Short mmCIF file of C-alpha atoms in Angstrom, two decimals:
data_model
loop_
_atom_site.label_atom_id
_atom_site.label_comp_id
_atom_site.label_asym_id
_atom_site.label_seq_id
_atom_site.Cartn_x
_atom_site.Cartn_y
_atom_site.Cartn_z
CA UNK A 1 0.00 0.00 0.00
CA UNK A 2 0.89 3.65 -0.52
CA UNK A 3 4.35 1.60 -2.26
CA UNK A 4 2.42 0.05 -4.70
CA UNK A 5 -1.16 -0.95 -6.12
CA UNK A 6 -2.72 -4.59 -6.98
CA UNK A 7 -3.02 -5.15 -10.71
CA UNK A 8 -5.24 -8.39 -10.53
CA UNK A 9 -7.07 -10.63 -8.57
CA UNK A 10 -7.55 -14.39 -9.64
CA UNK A 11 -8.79 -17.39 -8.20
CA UNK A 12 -6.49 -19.85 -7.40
CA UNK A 13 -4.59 -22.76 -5.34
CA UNK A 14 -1.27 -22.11 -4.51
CA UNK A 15 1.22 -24.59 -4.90
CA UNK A 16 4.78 -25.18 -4.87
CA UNK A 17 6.72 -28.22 -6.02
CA UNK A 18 8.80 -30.37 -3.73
CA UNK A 19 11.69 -31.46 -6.49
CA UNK A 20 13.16 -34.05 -3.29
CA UNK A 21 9.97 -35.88 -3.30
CA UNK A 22 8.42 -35.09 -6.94
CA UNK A 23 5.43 -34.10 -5.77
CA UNK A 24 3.17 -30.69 -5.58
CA UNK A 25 2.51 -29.19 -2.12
CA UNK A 26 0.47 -26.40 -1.23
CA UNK A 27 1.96 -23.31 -0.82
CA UNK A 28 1.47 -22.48 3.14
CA UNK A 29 1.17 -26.02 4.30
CA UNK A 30 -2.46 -25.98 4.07
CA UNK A 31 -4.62 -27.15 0.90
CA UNK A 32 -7.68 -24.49 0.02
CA UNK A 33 -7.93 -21.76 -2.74
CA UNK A 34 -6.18 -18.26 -2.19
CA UNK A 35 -6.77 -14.76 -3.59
CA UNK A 36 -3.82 -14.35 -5.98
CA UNK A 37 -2.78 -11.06 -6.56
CA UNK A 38 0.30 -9.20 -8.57
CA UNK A 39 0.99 -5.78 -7.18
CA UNK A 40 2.88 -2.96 -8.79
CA UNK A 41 5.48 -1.13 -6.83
CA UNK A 42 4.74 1.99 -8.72
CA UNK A 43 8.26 4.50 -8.05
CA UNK A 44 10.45 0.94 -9.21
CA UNK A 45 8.41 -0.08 -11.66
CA UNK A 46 9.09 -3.63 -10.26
CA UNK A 47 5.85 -6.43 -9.92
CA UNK A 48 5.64 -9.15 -7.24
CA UNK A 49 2.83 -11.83 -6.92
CA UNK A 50 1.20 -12.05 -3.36
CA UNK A 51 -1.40 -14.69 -2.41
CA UNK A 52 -3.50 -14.88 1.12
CA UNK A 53 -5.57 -17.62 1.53
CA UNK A 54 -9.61 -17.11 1.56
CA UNK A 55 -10.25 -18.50 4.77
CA UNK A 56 -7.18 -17.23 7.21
CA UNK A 57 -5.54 -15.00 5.20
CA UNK A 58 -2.69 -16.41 5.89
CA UNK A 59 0.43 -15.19 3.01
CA UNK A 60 0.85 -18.24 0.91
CA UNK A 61 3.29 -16.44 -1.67
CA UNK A 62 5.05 -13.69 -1.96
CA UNK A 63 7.72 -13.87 -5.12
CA UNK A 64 9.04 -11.02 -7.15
CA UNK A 65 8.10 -11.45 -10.71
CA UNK A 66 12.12 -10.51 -12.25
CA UNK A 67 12.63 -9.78 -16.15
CA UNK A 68 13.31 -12.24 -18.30
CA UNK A 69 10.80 -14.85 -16.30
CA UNK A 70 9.18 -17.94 -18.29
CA UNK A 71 5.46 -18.22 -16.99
CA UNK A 72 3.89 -21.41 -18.53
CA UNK A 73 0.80 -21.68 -19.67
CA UNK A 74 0.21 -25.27 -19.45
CA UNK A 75 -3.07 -25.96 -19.07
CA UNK A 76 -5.89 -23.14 -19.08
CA UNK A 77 -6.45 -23.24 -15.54
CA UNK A 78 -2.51 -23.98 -14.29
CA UNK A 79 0.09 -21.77 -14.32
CA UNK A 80 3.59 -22.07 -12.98
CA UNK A 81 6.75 -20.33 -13.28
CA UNK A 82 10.25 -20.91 -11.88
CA UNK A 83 12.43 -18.45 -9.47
CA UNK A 84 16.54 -19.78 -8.58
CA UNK A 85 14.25 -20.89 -5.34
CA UNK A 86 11.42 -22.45 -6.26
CA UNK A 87 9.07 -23.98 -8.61
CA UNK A 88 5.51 -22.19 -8.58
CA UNK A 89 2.07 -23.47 -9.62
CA UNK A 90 -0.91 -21.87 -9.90
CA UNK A 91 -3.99 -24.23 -10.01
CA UNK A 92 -6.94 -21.64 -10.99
CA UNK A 93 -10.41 -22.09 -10.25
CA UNK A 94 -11.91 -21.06 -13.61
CA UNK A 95 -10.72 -20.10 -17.05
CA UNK A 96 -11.37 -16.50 -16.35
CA UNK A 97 -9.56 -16.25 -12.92
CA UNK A 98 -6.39 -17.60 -14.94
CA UNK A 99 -6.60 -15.42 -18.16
CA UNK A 100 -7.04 -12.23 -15.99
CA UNK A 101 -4.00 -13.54 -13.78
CA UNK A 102 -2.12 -14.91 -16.98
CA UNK A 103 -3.12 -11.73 -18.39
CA UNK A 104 -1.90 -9.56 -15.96
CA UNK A 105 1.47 -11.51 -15.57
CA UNK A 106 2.09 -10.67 -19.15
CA UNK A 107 1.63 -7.69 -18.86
CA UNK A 108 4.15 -7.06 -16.16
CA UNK A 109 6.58 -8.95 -18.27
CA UNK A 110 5.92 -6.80 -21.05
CA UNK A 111 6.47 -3.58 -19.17
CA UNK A 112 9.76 -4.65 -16.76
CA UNK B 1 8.63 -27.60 -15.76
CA UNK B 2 7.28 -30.19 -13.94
CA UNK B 3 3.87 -31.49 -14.89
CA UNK B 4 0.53 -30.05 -13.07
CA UNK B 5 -0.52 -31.40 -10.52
CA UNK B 6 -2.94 -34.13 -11.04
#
């Protein structure tokens, strides 16, 4: 807030993947659907995606989106992209909640 | 890119 200003909102389940055990986890610990949003630090011109789950609110991710990044598309409703950290996976819960995100992502690629 | 989830 006042730093910078949320560009989307999307419907999703946050997940990371566990490359030890090749396997998807939820982002948190706990499974359920978050409210996904990228915000814009306006005076850096930078972008970083933030997710709070629905029920608890509780900060599920919180990743800089840097320039350059490679955000699959593959599936309509699952997204995931790649930091030097982690693997990131966004399992949408409609078409529309991931073409605004996807949308928006783009975007912020676009612009950075 | 590790295939989604399920």
């Amino acid at each position: 807030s006042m730093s910078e200003q949320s560009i989307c909102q999307a419907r999703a389940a946050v997940m990371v993947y566990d490359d030890a055990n090749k396997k998807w986890v939820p982002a948190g610990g706990s499974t359920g659907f978050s409210r996904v949003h990228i915000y814009h630090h306006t005076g850096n011109n930078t972008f970083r995606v933030v997710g709070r789950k629905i029920q608890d609110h509780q900060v599920v991710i919180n990743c800089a989106i840097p320039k350059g990044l490679k955000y699959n598309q593959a599936t309509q409703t699952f997204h995931q992209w790649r930091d030097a950290r982690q693997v990131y996976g966004l399992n949408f819960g409609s078409k529309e909640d991931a073409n605004v995100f996807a949308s928006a992502m783009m975007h912020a690629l676009e612009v950075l | 890119x590790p295939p989604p989830p399920x």
